[PDB]
Amino acid sequence: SDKGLCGGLNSNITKYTRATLATTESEGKDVVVVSIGDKGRSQLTRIESQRYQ
């Protein structure tokens, strides 16, 4: 989401996108991370700082 008064939504898939980006790469792949919404960039550079583009 853009606004951040949602209550366990924008960090819930951040728990899931870190659970998927720990599932796919076990073989040395490239990953580019994109977030839609202001609450996505503000919680993806917390976990994934280099592959966020």
Partner: protein
């Protein structure tokens, strides 16, 4: 360089081609219906490349009449 249809050999994607044909079809409806299809024509968002984890430039989209027909 490329191989494909006439939009693909000019540097235009399928989504840019097929929205253009949806752009020009919305204009030639009745004004009872054109003003309704005017609502889904507007594109408003902003993208920003993020090179370092911290910063980058940003590029705002404000087009109300449809997708950019120009070469991007």
């Amino acid at each position: 360089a490329p191989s494909g249809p006439f939009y693909r050999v000019a540097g235009m994607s399928y989504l840019r081609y097929s929205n253009i044909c949806a752009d020009l079809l919305r204009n030639v409806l009745k004004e009872p219906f054109k003003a309704k299809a005017q609502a889904r024509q507007a594109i408003h968002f902003r993208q920003a490349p993020y090179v370092d984890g911290k910063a980058g430039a940003s590029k705002v989209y404000e087009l109300e009449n449809g997708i950019p027909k120009t070469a991007n």
